[PDB]
Design an enzyme around this catalytic site. Structure first.
Site, PDB file in Angstrom:
ATOM      1  N   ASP C 274      -2.456  -1.836  10.070  1.00  0.00           N
ATOM      2  CA  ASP C 274      -1.208  -1.361   9.476  1.00  0.00           C
ATOM      3  C   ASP C 274      -0.540  -2.466   8.636  1.00  0.00           C
ATOM      4  OD1 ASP C 274      -0.384   1.224  11.663  1.00  0.00           O
ATOM      5  OD2 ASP C 274      -1.790  -0.360  12.311  1.00  0.00           O
ATOM      6  N   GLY C 409       2.120   1.006   3.291  1.00  0.00           N
ATOM      7  CA  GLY C 409       0.791   1.023   2.687  1.00  0.00           C
ATOM      8  C   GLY C 409       0.486   2.258   1.861  1.00  0.00           C
ATOM      9  N   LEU C 410       0.581   3.437   2.479  1.00  0.00           N
ATOM     10  CA  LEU C 410       0.250   4.692   1.802  1.00  0.00           C
ATOM     11  C   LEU C 410       1.077   4.860   0.526  1.00  0.00           C
ATOM     12  CD1 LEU C 410       0.149   8.333   3.217  1.00  0.00           C
ATOM     13  CD2 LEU C 410      -1.064   7.402   1.266  1.00  0.00           C
TER      14      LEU C 410
HETATM   15  C1  PMR Z   1      -4.952  12.317   9.732  1.00  0.00           C
HETATM   16  C2  PMR Z   1      -4.658  11.156  10.449  1.00  0.00           C
HETATM   17  C3  PMR Z   1      -4.062  10.043   9.844  1.00  0.00           C
HETATM   18  C4  PMR Z   1      -3.118   9.238  10.410  1.00  0.00           C
HETATM   19  C5  PMR Z   1      -2.484   9.369  11.800  1.00  0.00           C
HETATM   20  C6  PMR Z   1      -2.819   8.262   9.484  1.00  0.00           C
HETATM   21  C7  PMR Z   1      -1.903   7.262   9.671  1.00  0.00           C
HETATM   22  C8  PMR Z   1      -1.670   6.209   8.825  1.00  0.00           C
HETATM   23  N1  PMR Z   1      -2.285   6.019   7.628  1.00  0.00           N
HETATM   24 MG1  PMR Z   1      -3.359   7.387   6.725  1.00  0.00          MG
HETATM   25  N2  PMR Z   1      -3.546   8.423   8.353  1.00  0.00           N
HETATM   26  C9  PMR Z   1      -4.315   9.520   8.581  1.00  0.00           C
HETATM   27  C10 PMR Z   1      -5.211   9.995   7.656  1.00  0.00           C
HETATM   28  C11 PMR Z   1      -5.302   9.606   6.336  1.00  0.00           C
HETATM   29  N3  PMR Z   1      -4.620   8.558   5.800  1.00  0.00           N
HETATM   30  C12 PMR Z   1      -5.028   8.545   4.497  1.00  0.00           C
HETATM   31  C13 PMR Z   1      -4.581   7.628   3.573  1.00  0.00           C
HETATM   32  C14 PMR Z   1      -3.930   6.470   3.905  1.00  0.00           C
HETATM   33  C15 PMR Z   1      -3.737   5.350   3.102  1.00  0.00           C
HETATM   34  C16 PMR Z   1      -4.228   5.149   1.655  1.00  0.00           C
HETATM   35  C17 PMR Z   1      -3.021   4.440   3.826  1.00  0.00           C
HETATM   36  C18 PMR Z   1      -2.834   5.078   5.037  1.00  0.00           C
HETATM   37  C19 PMR Z   1      -2.111   4.322   5.943  1.00  0.00           C
HETATM   38  C20 PMR Z   1      -1.741   4.851   7.167  1.00  0.00           C
HETATM   39  C21 PMR Z   1      -0.773   4.337   8.041  1.00  0.00           C
HETATM   40  C22 PMR Z   1       0.088   3.063   7.910  1.00  0.00           C
HETATM   41  C23 PMR Z   1       1.564   3.385   7.597  1.00  0.00           C
HETATM   42  C24 PMR Z   1       1.749   4.009   6.202  1.00  0.00           C
HETATM   43  O1  PMR Z   1       1.422   3.333   5.199  1.00  0.00           O
HETATM   44  O2  PMR Z   1       2.222   5.162   6.172  1.00  0.00           O
HETATM   45  C25 PMR Z   1      -0.754   5.209   9.088  1.00  0.00           C
HETATM   46  C26 PMR Z   1       0.129   5.124  10.347  1.00  0.00           C
HETATM   47  C27 PMR Z   1      -1.795   2.984   5.233  1.00  0.00           C
HETATM   48  C28 PMR Z   1      -2.383   1.742   5.924  1.00  0.00           C
HETATM   49  O3  PMR Z   1      -1.697   0.724   6.019  1.00  0.00           O
HETATM   50  O4  PMR Z   1      -3.654   1.767   6.414  1.00  0.00           O
HETATM   51  C29 PMR Z   1      -4.080   0.517   6.980  1.00  0.00           C
HETATM   52  C30 PMR Z   1      -2.424   3.188   3.868  1.00  0.00           C
HETATM   53  O5  PMR Z   1      -2.384   2.376   2.944  1.00  0.00           O
HETATM   54  N4  PMR Z   1      -3.364   6.308   5.120  1.00  0.00           N
HETATM   55  C31 PMR Z   1      -5.931   9.561   4.199  1.00  0.00           C
HETATM   56  C32 PMR Z   1      -6.578   9.828   2.819  1.00  0.00           C
HETATM   57  C33 PMR Z   1      -7.209  11.214   2.635  1.00  0.00           C
HETATM   58  C34 PMR Z   1      -6.102  10.220   5.383  1.00  0.00           C
HETATM   59  C35 PMR Z   1      -7.010  11.448   5.608  1.00  0.00           C
END
Ligand code: PMR
Ligand code: PMR
Ligand code: SF4
Ligand code: SF4
Lengths: 414, 418, 418, 415
Positions: C274, C409-410
């Site tokens: 994270d 991040g996201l």
């Molecule tokens: C479906 C389950 C799930 C969960 C609980 C998280 C949490 C989470 N995803 Mg995410 N993520 C999920 C899925 C996905 N993420 C996705 C994308 C994504 C990205 C690009 C990123 C991310 C992140 C996160 C994060 C970190 C907090 C945030 O940035 O919102 C959580 C809790 C974040 C990160 O720091 O990853 C190391 C980050 O840059 N998610 C994608 C792309 C299709 C999917 C399917």
């Protein structure tokens, strides 16, 4: 020393830790402006999309789930009538939708809901304003990025016909990357070039017996087939990752369009030098480090190739959810000979192999990343490679940076 | 079919994962497709866990359907037991597996494993996450808890705390402190931190503290029948509710209420002249029943807000919420539809919103102050720092939390005449 | 003359007020004009104390100047003593009274009160608030502290915590916990909570924990000469600094370092994936020397930020700050002028600012994320909830606090490729 | 039963808990758009202004402090060419300032800095673009709102002369209040009417032997004297607080300008019933409640008069920092005759009287408020009465609400 052309790939089934193809909607809906993606599934599928989407779910996105209710679970003819009512209600409210994708899931497929036929009948009903398609993004059928492949392949039969000898670049790319791609190709004297998918429904490429296409993304097996079925001919190339991958990709297009060697060299010289320079900044931390990749997206082979050849990394096991032999050929020929290749996954077996190897950097999903970190294994979460501009020259350093960063953080924190 | 963008709760099998992941030495096996492991990320990413959840999926896919799906579930149970040697196991069906013909009870009995394998009944098309957790924990208590001798010392069980629970970690710690001050020690905290063996010795506790009705109500009711243990009906969120909780516990045990209030600062904060501008601030409250009932009392009786809306997304808490809402002269809003929440907010035009992550985003679009009081919640609401909602430190935390988004008194007076 | 809008520190007489207000049973009398009581509001409103500060002003004005000013001071000293019967008193001049020629030492001695009246020398035109506090506390310790036999058990004093100190309340609580786990009890915490009679018993401690050099340094040095007490040089803000502090205490006492790390969550929060987006994020750090030095180490070595600017407003801490800044390849910004801080921030182009309430507002103006790490601070940074900066819980608090303002991040990935 | 004309007022001195007149800059600078307020003082004075201003300090306000350095204290130190350097530099980058106020403080006065001389020197040096004035806002000379008085008074000798018979309304009021006042007087047929201070420096009122002025604020004794020196005549009136206060104030102006009874009652009936109804919303909580006022601002007498007569409160001790007898005579004639009046303060003795009275509601400053709350006394912090629109008909309900609010919060939180 280089070349995995004839390397025996371990094909493996068992417990898997991958995403279904539904997840593709998360990036597809951003690229495809006129489009709506309607999953037919359960609360599970909706829950996946909202957790995946993150802040996107609040940004009024162009997707949703018709969640199956108990009454929908029996009687196929009635379920089809309910779907039509739900679609009529969505479309009536939303004149902005020009493309509607009915997306298959595990529940809809076990129910044997013929969404292909629903799309056919809904296109007929809501023509000419809304074209409706059907494709599978179910976990039974697809892994992660394969959802883009089934999506694009569904559009292909319906594309306009043409006798023009145009280029189609296939794959949804970030706008900056797409713009650089168009520019480089125009400088090389190749055109008109169109993208699949387009940014709008009214500007999709036409296809015919003189069309050439090139894949920007490795996971595009179905779409390739569908384009070939329309008479289009594929340009084989390594994937445009890093300075070398990009050069070899542009060179294949150039050679196909009879571009001179002098013209190629003059257009490509400066961006090539700038890419190699950007990468060099990450070489000290990356060189000599062992690399291990869990299967997620089909970007593994091309990225392993980039990291070994351009960043000095040592490959160990490089795993992919699916390996399209013909499409992956150019990259396999460049991948170092030592590489142990895996298609599929037996999770616990693969994790045992992982521990025995003790690799310096592990590419893996978010379900594995933290547990692996806690065991002293530096990781690089796999999703980022689909959510960062990483193709072509301008992004070559950034791509290397994605892998140097977690090792630099580890060193920084102890 | 029901068109869905946002869902407040996930499917019931995610609730099962919340119980299994809360526990130690229990393996959950879910009959489900490849892809459903996405739910693992809830625990590894949001709750930020340092291990893979004790949850494996049978992982059926299109090339291995039919008579293979039953084989795959069998292999998944065998492999999970052989690898992890758990004290017990649970087996349930995903939404997709519900549409299949495989019998998890029948399959597990034909494997004849050395430990109990508890089958779970989770109806994925009619019920949701909270029910899944409430039911899973109930089924485990039914299978493992027996009539016992009571402990010589007055002890209790804490019931309802799970993985992915909103401030469950610190609520557990804070409620424990409250009880220790009265001379009451915890026997077993379950599901969170408990092993199947801990569940076997639930009976020896004098009584039960129902921390969270949505995730512990069924097991509390079973243990009242099976183990003759009364359970607390008051959830200690808020100063007044904590005092009512302590007096409730006092009637159960005969022990006098003893409090350490040397660190209880919310009453003075609220009484101080800085807080006078808070009087009559119109607050809209949404989330799960427990947290919304608790928030409304604090809002009205402890902070001095006017409560202008009350609702919950979980129908299991619909009646207690309707009852509570009427005391404020309000009709409870019972809905899982964020668009309805948004409309009710718009019609009430509150000055503050207390809700979930969805209400934070509704508030942002509307340009309104908002604080989080309930799951579903993002990673930020799983903090590194001590952040209970319960007890005396909870009241402190909640005061700081709700007041933060609001423009302060002075800035208000500048609106205004300048 | 200096054109001034914002000041990081008040006049030194405010520092005197926050030593007096920290203590019990001590009356401070300030020779000052009517109007200077505005400073009482700092305590009653920002710290929201429930009693008037133990401070009174002689209250001279236009109709009682000349020979009356000396009488008004005499009366003020006499009246304060008769009414409150303190164990000791302090007398000092306000900036306006410094331009007068009245002698508070001679006036107080002629009055001949049955308790000590400690005269204070606070140069208002050259020195500021922190010096005022440090010198007041020093003057009181030199008047009252006396050589004693050591306590039979290993004990320390805590030195430097005052009224109106940024997180002084909870830092005291957290440091006390750190020491108790090592089997070290606190003799006197001073000035905060201490009476004049407590200051008399300072010498029986084995050593001193110097919590805040800006408000305790001078008294720590005196107690080292007078009472042969070592004092700690490391301020336990951050995980590393807390460990070095405990190793330091261990060397002073010969006791092994013992820690309870059961709720230390910052290292894992920071090590989790994270947090990888936090790598190399450019941080500008400003505030008092103690908090800036501590923050830079956490930033660089615990969270993984790139420190791109470091400075403090109190030039009493300039030496250690210059020494700290050099470790990062930086020259320290030593200035009390916020415009010069603003210029330095703009030039360094950081992604995060850690500083004072002033930097909060500079950050708002520039559209940049900011967290508070140091006084001067508003009412919000005097929280109802447990909020230490020190020790292991402080590390938790600091992690949550610093990452809060940063988009996640996201969001970052959506705001670049879409 | 009503009338404190002949009531003995306690003249009390000793320890005081009040603001200096510097604090008036906080509201003055918002009203006076092209003015700058330069305090010549110490870090103490800048510290006060910063604390008082709160959020404003970060909004690039039109005030500052030339803080005295150790070097400025010396007997050869030319602090006047230092001050001239300071203002030249300030004005150089600020061509928007058309009015500069050199504000005196305790340090500047004890040091005997002649800021009056400086103002004349500097306005000669910076004519015609900026006029510079001098007034005291020191704790030695002034309490809180009296800094508004010394400011306005400094402007008066400088105002254009006129033979015109116009009305000046004196006192910085919120814009919304000023517009309402201006509207009501226009409706009555009185005009043209101007405010001191004006919103901008180029539209200040002229003064002459036919000028009438009426005070909107009680703390304006020096400004009253200065205007009377230019030949202007005051209209005596109770202060425009509440329905009755506002009617009496308007009626005084109406009577002054030969406005008929028919027109007064017709313009006034609807606003009056509206104000009286808005006040009634606060009567149940306020009626029968005893009131104690510590001295802060000079609004105590007129506000006590409004709370007793319109809100049914019972006065105990009502204290004021200064009691201008001529100006306060109308309000004093209306105060309940039981009221103990105090000018000034001896803090401990006054708190002792407060304690023995045990009043239901206490108006006091922010230094006393929380301490008094902690002893079980419901408080109404006094600053709000200068920082809320409270004058005239439309704000009469809001004014009653300022006092009912703490009592309602106390009930709401204790059951
Ligand atoms: C479906 C389950 C799930 C969960 C609980 C998280 C949490 C989470 N995803 Mg995410 N993520 C999920 C899925 C996905 N993420 C996705 C994308 C994504 C990205 C690009 C990123 C991310 C992140 C996160 C994060 C970190 C907090 C945030 O940035 O919102 C959580 C809790 C974040 C990160 O720091 O990853 C190391 C980050 O840059 N998610 C994608 C792309 C299709 C999917 C399917
Ligand atoms: C000079 C000292 C001082 C301090 C420390 C505070 C703190 C403070 N003053 Mg303020 N205030 C001070 C003075 C003043 N205040 C002033 C104004 C003011 C208002 C209108 C208000 C206020 C308030 C505050 C507050 C509460 C927090 C805030 O509103 O920022 C603090 C800490 C706040 C309140 O709730 O009072 C009960 C509020 O509405 N102050 C004024 C007007 C000239 C002055 C001189
Ligand atoms: S499509 Fe299948 S694998 Fe994907 S979320 Fe829905 S049920 Fe799970
Ligand atoms: S009372 Fe005097 S010294 Fe104090 S702030 Fe006011 S003018 Fe400055």
């Amino acid at each position: 020393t280089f070349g995995c052309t004839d390397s025996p790939v371990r094909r493996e089934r068992g417990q898997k830790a991958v995403f279904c193809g539904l997840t593709s909607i998360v990036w597809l809906h951003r690229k495809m402006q006129d489009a709506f993606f309607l999953v037919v599934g359960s609360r599970t599928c909706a829950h996946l999309l909202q957790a995946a989407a993150g802040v996107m779910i609040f940004a009024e996105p162009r997707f949703g789930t018709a969640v199956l209710e108990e009454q929908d679970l029996a009687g196929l003819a009635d379920a089809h009538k309910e779907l039509d009512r739900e679609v009529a209600k969505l479309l009536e409210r939303r004149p902005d939708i020009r493309q509607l994708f009915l997306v298959g899931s595990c529940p809809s497929e076990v129910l044997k809901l013929d969404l292909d036929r629903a799309a056919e009948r809904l296109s007929g009903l809501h023509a000419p304003h809304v074209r409706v398609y059907s494709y599978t993004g179910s976990g039974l059928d697809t892994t992660f990025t394969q959802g883009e492949d089934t999506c694009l392949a569904a559009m292909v039969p319906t594309l306009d016909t043409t006798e023009a000898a145009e280029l189609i670049v296939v794959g949804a790319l970030p706008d900056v990357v797409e713009d650089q791609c168009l520019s480089l190709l125009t400088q090389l004297g190749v055109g008109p070039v169109r993208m699949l998918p387009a940014r709008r429904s009214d500007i999709e490429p036409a296809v015919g017996p003189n069309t050439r296409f090139i894949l920007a993304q490795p996971f595009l097996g179905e779409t390739t087939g569908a384009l070939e079925r329309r008479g289009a001919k594929r340009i084989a190339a390594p994937f445009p990752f890093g300075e070398e991958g990009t050069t070899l990709w542009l060179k294949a297009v150039a050679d196909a369009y009879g571009v001179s060697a002098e013209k190629f060299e003059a257009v490509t010289a400066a961006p090539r030098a700038r890419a190699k320079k950007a990468i060099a900044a990450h070489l000290e931390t990356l060189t000599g480090k062992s690399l291990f990749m869990f299967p997620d997206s089909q970007l593994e082979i091309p990225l392993a190739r980039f990291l070994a050849r351009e960043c000095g990394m040592k490959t160990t096991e490089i795993a992919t959810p699916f390996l399209h032999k013909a499409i992956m050929a150019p990259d396999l020929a460049l991948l170092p000979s030592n590489t142990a290749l895996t298609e599929g996954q037996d999770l616990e077996a693969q994790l045992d192999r992982h521990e025995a190897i003790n690799p310096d950097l592990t590419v893996c999903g978010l379900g594995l990343a933290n547990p692996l970190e806690a065991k002293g294994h530096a990781t690089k979460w796999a999703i980022e490679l689909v959510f960062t501009p990483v193709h072509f020259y301008e992004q070559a350093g950034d791509l290397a940076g994605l892998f140097s960063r977690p090792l630099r953080r580890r060193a920084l924190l102890n | 079919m029901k068109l869905t963008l946002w869902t407040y709760e996930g499917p019931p099998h995610v609730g099962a994962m919340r119980v299994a992941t809360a526990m130690k030495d229990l393996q959950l096996v879910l009959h489900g497709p490849q892809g459903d492991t996405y739910a693992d990320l809830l625990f590894t990413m949001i709750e930020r866990r340092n291990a893979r959840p004790p949850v494996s999926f049978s992982t059926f896919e299109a090339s291995h359907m039919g008579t293979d799906t039953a084989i795959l579930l069998k292999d998944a149970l065998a492999a999970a037991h052989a690898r992890y040697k758990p004290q017990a196991m649970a087996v349930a069906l995903t939404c997709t597996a519900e549409l299949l013909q495989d019998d998890p009870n029948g399959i597990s009995r034909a494997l004849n494993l050395p430990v109990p394998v508890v089958p779970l009944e989770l109806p994925s098309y009619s019920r949701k996450e909270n029910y899944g957790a409430d039911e899973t924990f109930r089924a485990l208590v039914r299978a493992l808890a027996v009539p016992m001798e009571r402990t010589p010392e007055v002890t209790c069980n804490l019931l309802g705390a799970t993985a992915l629970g909103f401030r469950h970690r610190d609520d557990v710690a804070e409620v424990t402190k409250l009880l220790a001050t009265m001379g009451i020690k915890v026997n077993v905290c379950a599901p969170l931190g408990a092993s199947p063996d801990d569940l076997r010795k639930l009976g020896q506790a004098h009584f039960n503290v129902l921390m969270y009705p949505e995730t512990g109500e069924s097991a509390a009711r079973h243990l009242e029948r099976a183990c003759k243990q009364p359970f607390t009906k008051i959830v200690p969120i808020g100063v007044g509710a904590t005092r009512d909780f302590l007096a409730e516990v006092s009637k159960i045990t005969g022990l006098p209420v003893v409090t350490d209030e040397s660190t209880l600062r919310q009453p003075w904060w609220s009484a101080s002249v800085d807080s006078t501008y808070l009087t009559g601030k119109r607050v809209f409250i949404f989330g799960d029943g427990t947290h919304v009932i608790a928030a409304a009392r604090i809002a009205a009786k402890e902070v001095g807000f006017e409560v202008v809306g009350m609702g919950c997304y979980n129908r299991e808490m619909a009646r207690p919420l309707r009852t509570a809402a009427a005391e404020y002269g309000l009709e409870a809003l019972i809905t899982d539809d964020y668009l309805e929440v948004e409309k009710a907010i718009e019609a009430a035009a509150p000055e503050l919103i207390l809700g979930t992550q969805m209400e934070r985003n509704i508030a942002k679009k509307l340009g309104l102050p908002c604080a989080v009081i309930s799951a579903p919640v993002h990673v930020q609401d799983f903090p590194a720092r001590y952040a209970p909602q319960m007890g005396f430190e909870g009241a402190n935390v909640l005061f700081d939390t709700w007041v933060h988004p609001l423009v302060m008194g002075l800035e208000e007076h500048l609106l205004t005449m300048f």
